[PDB]
Write a protein that binds this ligand. Sequence first.
Ligand SMILES: [K+]
Ligand SMILES: [K+]
Ligand SMILES: [Mg+2]
Ligand SMILES: [Mg+2]
Ligand SMILES: [Mg+2]
Ligand SMILES: [Mg+2]
Ligand SMILES: [Mg+2]
Ligand SMILES: [Mg+2]
Ligand SMILES: [Mg+2]
Ligand SMILES: [Mg+2]
Ligand SMILES: [Mg+2]
Ligand SMILES: [Mg+2]
Ligand SMILES: [Mg+2]
Ligand SMILES: [Mg+2]
Ligand SMILES: [Mg+2]
Ligand SMILES: [Mg+2]
Ligand SMILES: [Mg+2]
Ligand SMILES: [Mg+2]
Ligand SMILES: [Mg+2]
Ligand SMILES: [Mg+2]
Lengths: 50, 77, 124, 240, 244, 97
Amino acid sequence: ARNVVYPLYRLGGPQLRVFRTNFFIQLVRPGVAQPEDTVQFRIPMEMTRV
Amino acid sequence: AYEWGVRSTRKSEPPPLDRVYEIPGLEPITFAGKMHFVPWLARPIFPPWDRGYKDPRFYRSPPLHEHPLYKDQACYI
Amino acid sequence: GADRMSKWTSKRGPRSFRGRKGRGAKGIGFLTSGWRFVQIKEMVPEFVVPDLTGFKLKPYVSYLAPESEETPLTAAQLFSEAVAPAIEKDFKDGTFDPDNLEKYGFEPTQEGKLFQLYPRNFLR
Amino acid sequence: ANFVSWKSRTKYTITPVKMRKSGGRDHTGRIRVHGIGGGHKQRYRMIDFLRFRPEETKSGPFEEKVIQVRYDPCRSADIALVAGGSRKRWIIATENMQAGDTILNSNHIGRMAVAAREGDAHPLGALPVGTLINNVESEPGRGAQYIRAAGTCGVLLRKVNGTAIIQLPSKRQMQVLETCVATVGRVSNVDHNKRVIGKAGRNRWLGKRPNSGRWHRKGGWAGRKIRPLPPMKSYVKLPS
Amino acid sequence: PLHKYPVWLWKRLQLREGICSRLPGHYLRSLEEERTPTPVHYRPHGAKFKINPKNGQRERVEDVPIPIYFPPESQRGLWGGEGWILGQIYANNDKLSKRLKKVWKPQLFEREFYSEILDKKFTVTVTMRTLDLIDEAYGLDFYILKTPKEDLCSKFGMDLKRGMLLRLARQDPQLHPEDPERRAAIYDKYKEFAIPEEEAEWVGLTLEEAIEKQRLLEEKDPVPLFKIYVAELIQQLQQQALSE
Amino acid sequence: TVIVERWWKVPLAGEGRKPRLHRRHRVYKLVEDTKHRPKENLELILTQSVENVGVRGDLVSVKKSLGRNRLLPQGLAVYASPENKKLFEEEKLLRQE
RNA sequence: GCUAAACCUAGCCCCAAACCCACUCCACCUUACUACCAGACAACCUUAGCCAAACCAUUUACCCAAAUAAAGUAUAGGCGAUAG
RNA sequence: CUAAGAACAGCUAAAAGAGCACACCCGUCUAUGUAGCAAAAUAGUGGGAAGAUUUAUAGGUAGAGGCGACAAACCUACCGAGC
RNA sequence: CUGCGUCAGAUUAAAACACUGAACUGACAAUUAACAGCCCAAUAUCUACAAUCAACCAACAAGUCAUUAUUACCCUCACUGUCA
RNA sequence: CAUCACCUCUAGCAUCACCAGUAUUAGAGGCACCGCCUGCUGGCUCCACGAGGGUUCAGCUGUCUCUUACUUUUAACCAGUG
Ligand SMILES: [K+]
Ligand SMILES: [K+]
Ligand SMILES: [Mg+2]
Ligand SMILES: [Mg+2]
Ligand SMILES: [Mg+2]
Ligand SMILES: [Mg+2]
Ligand SMILES: [Mg+2]
Ligand SMILES: [Mg+2]
Ligand SMILES: [Mg+2]
Ligand SMILES: [Mg+2]
Ligand SMILES: [Mg+2]
Ligand SMILES: [Mg+2]
Ligand SMILES: [Mg+2]
Ligand SMILES: [Mg+2]
Ligand SMILES: [Mg+2]
Ligand SMILES: [Mg+2]
Ligand SMILES: [Mg+2]
Ligand SMILES: [Mg+2]
Ligand SMILES: [Mg+2]
Ligand SMILES: [Mg+2]
């Protein structure tokens, strides 16, 4: 999630879980030729590939 | 003899304690409750702190004499 | 000749400046010796997605619905709906004491809880 | 200025320590000594000027064997690497010192004088009168500070009541206790003052910058003006 | 435009609201008072009227104090109200000669004193004036207790007063625990300076220190509404049973 | 103590009002430095025998460089407070009786 | 007849009155607007000068808490300029 | 000035603040230009080009001063005292 | 810091031109990490012998590169730069 | 101007410059190598070197006697901008 404070993690701590996410992605058509399996999204800056 | 390490490069002496601590039966008023430094309040004396859990990235070894494999006789390696 | 009224981002500056500045994404690990990054599984936020099979509710609401007035939830309202019914039953029975408030649902301290209320240690 | 002295090492070692030049600048960043700047990079080799420093597990007189006499950039004189027991340290080499020689370091003061050998360290109370000495100390445990430069040598003029008169290379007498440890003989690089720089470029190799081009009419006598007394003020200058 | 209040009144206006208004009443009196300190670096006239020699008339005279600069190091000792005098002088004491900046500094000594109430010795920096004042007060403890705040001119001097007053108020047995008779004797000598513990705990504190002290007394975790509502619910239920 | 005086007269302010100081009112002239005045003798009541006087309760006067340094820190003497005199007066009275 | 020319509001000024503002989430003293590791660094100190004195060198007005009046008086001052 | 880096063909020579001569640095003479391409440039001709060299990066010294192989030079295109 | 990619434009001055006119306006599109940057548990303890093909030889201006002992530790490829 | 070389002056010592140094050193200066001569500091000679300032042999050439021809830019005219 974005614009929220992530709880700090230390060794042996609980798993970080998010139940409601505010990340909204949008599928877009690539402007250039792409491989068949490749899919292009627009994601918020705070979002990682993981 | 000539000591190695000029006093400027060594850690400076901590500032002298405020005179409020020298008066018995007197509780100093410090900035420990404000959680930040201010010049017009006494400097609190913080007790030593322990992390409370084992962290490999921030581990500090015990003193050398406290190591289990410590012998008075030296071994040349 | 530099633009001082534009947003300072990771795309500006030399190589050391560009790699040190980010975009706001939270860190999910740390760097070890040899510039090797170690990703911590517990630092990666895991999505708790429920099963939506056989779910009645839908994104929109039909217009053929009454215009109910809005009643914001308050602490006093929640206490009466949840805790008050239990206390009344115990009050009539005659077994009531402040020592047993933990049994009614009261939490004297937030330590030792997976989801602490203040300060909260969970995401939205 | 954010000036931190490189002299931060606290443990002695024979490893050459990298040092940063000052350029005549103090901690503030302004020039305090002129004509200093640039030159070839140098690594400082720590010198133990306290010749009598017995080991932690040892005491009393001990002996050291010279390993190598080499060139030191920091000082005019050469230095020698010696090994005594299980340690090695740098000392100031004498004029006649080679690899393999054995030097003696003692704090013993006998009833009579002893045969003084060049490079050995004995107290001033056990050295014959007139013997050339170098690397003297003001008081015991102070360390050698005087007669360090290449070829310099002092003179043991006299010894009376536990004190000795040392003739410094500047022909000045100095009185110190007879228990001060000194090194017998002259210092290495006797012909150091006989060198020729050859060109202005070699002075820039030693970290010395050219002098200011201003014509200073001021000097020891020219700049300082004796104030004429009112009676003598009339005779200061006479037209001719 | 104009301000509602003069600018010089804003300092006393901030004491009307906020945590300052919640400070004890006796403490607020000690700050708003402007008692004139005892003259040190100038000779007072001694009378309200004098006869001007030139015209032989009875003219009014006033004592105008000379500003005194107290260095920060003066707050860790007992200078007796002395301090650096930042002023000008005329060369050769001639008005027609040029004017030069002159600073007069007191002579400081690191003398040691012993306090009977605190049973502890201090190595403080004092002037020759402070030594004379302790001699005229017949002991360090009397000097600290008699000398007012504007005359001590030292934060350490006011801290000693607060410490001494608390021992005279709390009747703390920490003073000579092995000699109860001696402890009573010391408290019976300074009995003229008895101050209640409530008022003796704010003596010498500055405005910033008092604000911090008051905030600590007001610092508390908010009461959960569960306890509040349960108290309301039980009280309501008890009243309900009465009607039945 | 440096005691100084203003070269220039300060005009009267009145009752309840602060005087108006000018740039010229910062010019001072030294009147007297109390460090150069003749010394005085501190009056003390001795508790133990000393070389000057060996009688307890006998009022003595010595230089301030002696009472402050030796007599008072060592407990040899006490300040000549009026209350102390009354207490020692009773002690002397018991000796006579 | 082109370029142009005309317009009346926006708002502002001076008073009176009354003592003003700053937590929606997130980020912000490190290279501010940068989630996340042993610090110990800490504040306070006369204003000067231009200018006037036909130079300049002592000196030269600067709200200090009630409008008026006492009064530009007593005083101060290279007993000058001026200050009060 | 400090820190830690980089650059210098070929040839004659020799372990050279050597010679010739590119890159590079500098700017001797002449001409063009003079609101110009340019608030100092252009073309040709020149001095140096393994060294007291040239140069990129970061840091330091600030105006009652700094710095200066003294030209009263320079300190952000008016420095006998910056803005 | 999007600054001759695409499309459209009552378009229309880049020191001339311009319909496709285009180094103008609007919209849309884009530069994908392996390269580079962002590194490291503690406490002690170690590190005399240049470089120059480093072997000759010859130097001074004396130099640009090293650990071990014990304790702790076995989770894994994120982030940012990428156009003209 | 600086410059090796020479000379004068100052300083007997350490924990931020000098310096992690110690009178064969450091600083403040003069002069400008060397060689010869001199006093008890002064004057000549000389190797190379110089975008320094003069002079000169020979050659060279439109520098000139005495200018001329051609090419390019400019130029003038046409169009655009201005
Ligand atoms: K004038
Ligand atoms: K030349
Ligand atoms: Mg700008
Ligand atoms: Mg010189
Ligand atoms: Mg000169
Ligand atoms: Mg009045
Ligand atoms: Mg004038
Ligand atoms: Mg004039
Ligand atoms: Mg050459
Ligand atoms: Mg050449
Ligand atoms: Mg230069
Ligand atoms: Mg000149
Ligand atoms: Mg001139
Ligand atoms: Mg400028
Ligand atoms: Mg990589
Ligand atoms: Mg010259
Ligand atoms: Mg001629
Ligand atoms: Mg000819
Ligand atoms: Mg022809
Ligand atoms: Mg035309």
